[PDB]
Design a protein around this ligand. Structure first.
Ligand SMILES: N#Cc1ncncc1CC(=O)N1CCC[C@H](C(N)=O)C1
Ligand SMILES: [Zn+2]
Length: 139
C-alpha cells in the first residue's frame, strides 16, 4: 500500500484504488496501473521533473529504504492477477531490488522529488510506475 499526495490530487496503484478514489476520479490508465483521485486536503509532495536513473525506494516487506539504479520508462511484461491479464505495462521502470506482494505503492524518490511508485515485483526485480511525465499534477 501507499500513495502520492500533490496539490488536490492523490496518486495510487490503479489495482489498489478504493470506492472513494473511483467516486472522485480525475484520471486512470490501466496500461500504467495508475489512478489519480481528487482530495479535499492540500498535498505537499514534490514531483521530480528529470531523467534520473538512480534513487531510493521504500520497501514495506523489509521496513527499509534501498538505493537503486532503474531503467527508463518503457513497455514491459507482467503476469496475470485478480487485477490484470498478461500484458505490457507502459511507463514502467525496472531495478534490481527486492519486492513481493503488498510492496506496491512504496515511493521511489531521487534528489528532485517523487519519481514513481512500486507497481510490480518478482524474480529479484522491482518495477516502478513513473509519474514524472504527468505535468498536470502540479497545476
Ligand atoms: N509488487 C509485487 C510483486 N512482487 C512479487 N511477486 C509478485 C508481485 C505482484 C505483482 O507484480 N503484480 C500483482 C498486482 C498487479 C501488478 C501489475 N502492475 O500488473 C503485478
Ligand atoms: Zn531526478
Amino acid at each position: 500500500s501507499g500513495a502520492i499526495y500533490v496539490g488536490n490530487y492523490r496518486v495510487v496503484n490503479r489495482h489498489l484504488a478504493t470506492h472513494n478514489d473511483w467516486a472522485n476520479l480525475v484520471w486512470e490508465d490501466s496500461s500504467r496501473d495508475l489512478l489519480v483521485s481528487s482530495t479535499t486536503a492540500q498535498g505537499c509532495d514534490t514531483i521530480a521533473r528529470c531523467d534520473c536513473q538512480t534513487g531510493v525506494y521504500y520497501c514495506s516487506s523489509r521496513r527499509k529504504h534501498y538505493p537503486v539504479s532503474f531503467s527508463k520508462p518503457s513497455l514491459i511484461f507482467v503476469e496475470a492477477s485478480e487485477y490484470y491479464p498478461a500484458r505490457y505495462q507502459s511507463h514502467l521502470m525496472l531495478a534490481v531490488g527486492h519486492s513481493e506482494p503488498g510492496d506496491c505503492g512504496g515511493i521511489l524518490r531521487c534528489q528532485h522529488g517523487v519519481v514513481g511508485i512500486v507497481s510490480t515485483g518478482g524474480n529479484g526485480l522491482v518495477g516502478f510506475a513513473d509519474v514524472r511525465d504527468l505535468l498536470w499534477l502540479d497545476e
